[PDB]
């Protein structure tokens, strides 16, 4: 299962041919890691 999961995960790896398009995709994308916890064990994003 790990080999098959890794196999499908390589298709979106960055190569020399995907480099410019992926850098521009990274530049117009944005990911947020910040999230808060409450007094109860609940996540506020």
């Amino acid at each position: 299962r790990e080999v098959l999961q890794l196999q499908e995960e390589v298709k979106n790896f960055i190569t020399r041919e995907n480099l410019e398009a992926r850098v521009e995709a990274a530049l117009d994308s944005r990911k947020n890691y910040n999230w808060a916890i409450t007094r109860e064990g609940l996540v506020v994003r």
Binding site: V3, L6, Q7, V10, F13
Partner: protein
């Protein structure tokens, strides 16, 4: 010294190897791995080379082989980091333990 293109011990029994692409082969090869996995490969290679059953890991011979690959690792660490007194002690103690196990296996 196994070559860097050698496969991991946990991964060298899955049927799909020769058909996966070169980046996956590299990614699960030993170049994309560490010295603990290299020592595991070396130890099982020695086990296949010498002992009768390489699936025991509870015998005097298997314990001597494990101590020998650990002694080689302790050595190599010492000629990089010469001033490592804790690992010098570990190497000397492991040498004495291997000598004790050698004496027991000889007798």
């Amino acid at each position: 010294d196994p070559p860097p293109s050698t496969l991991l011990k946990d991964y060298q029994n899955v049927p799909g190897i020769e058909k996966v692409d070169d980046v996956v082969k590299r990614l699960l090869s030993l170049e994309m791995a560490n010295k603990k996995e290299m020592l595991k490969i070396k130890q099982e290679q020695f086990m296949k080379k010498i002992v009768a059953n390489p699936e025991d890991t509870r015998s005097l011979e298997a314990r001597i082989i494990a101590l020998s690959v650990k002694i080689r690792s302790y050595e190599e660490h010492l000629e990089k980091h010469r001033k490592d007194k804790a690992h010098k002690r570990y190497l000397l103690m492991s040498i004495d333990q291997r000598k004790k196990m050698l004496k027991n296996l000889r007798n």
